[PDB]
């Protein structure tokens, strides 16, 4: 049961720096911290511009900063350009994901 | 043709060499978005990456750029072992002509 925190998570601005924290992760495992959005049924687009790979410590925790965007040009798993994602209307979250696919449930972010 | 910070382009170009396929794939997608010609040669090298989603992302970026240099490498990638990479290459070639 790994968990994820985003501080702050509400009332964001385009360019806000947020603290992304993971707890209960697998020690020594890399997690991609990215801003995601569900743009359509079964469609998830990522912000390719602001993302970091953080590696979990012995205790199963990792921490990084993330620059959140209200609006971004979204990409799919295979590098397909989806188009503009607007976080005022689209369901935007911040996610920590390992190479498998696993890791915690994405933390919803609101502007 | 997008007015982008050249330091940002250099960073995404260095990121195509990262340990995380996620970082490499993200960098390849971001380079296509930027549409700079300086990313052409480093993205061509990425068409030979060990990850299927890095290779396809690099192929989509190259097509978005529209540079002719990518024609020979994209034809090679059309024979790639992965279906998504082959589909990316086909599209990227069509985004050039």
Numbering used by the authors:
A (entry chain A): 2 to 112
B (entry chain C): 8 to 104
Authors' description from the paper:
We have recently reported the design of a new artificial repeat protein family named αRep. This design was based on a specific subgroup of helicoidal repeats commonly found in thermophilic microorganisms.
Target NCS-3.24 is a β-sandwich protein. The structure of the NCS-3.24/bNCS-16 complex was determined to 2.6 Å resolution with two copies of the heterodimer in the asymmetric unit. The structure of bNCS-16 is very similar to those of A3 and bA3-2 (rmsd of 0.4–0.7 Å over 60–95 Cα atoms). In the structure of the NCS-3.24/bNCS-16 complex, the C-cap of the αRep protein (residues to 105 to 139) is not visible in the electron density due to partial degradation (residues 125 to 139, as observed for bA3-2) and to high flexibility of the remaining region (residues 105 to 124). The NCS-3.24/bNCS-16 complex involves an interface area of 720 Å2, with 17 residues from NCS-3.24 contacting 17 residues from bNCS-16. Ten out of 17 interacting residues from bNCS-16 locate within the N-cap of the protein while 5 and 2 interacting residues are from internal αRep repeats 1 and 2, respectively.
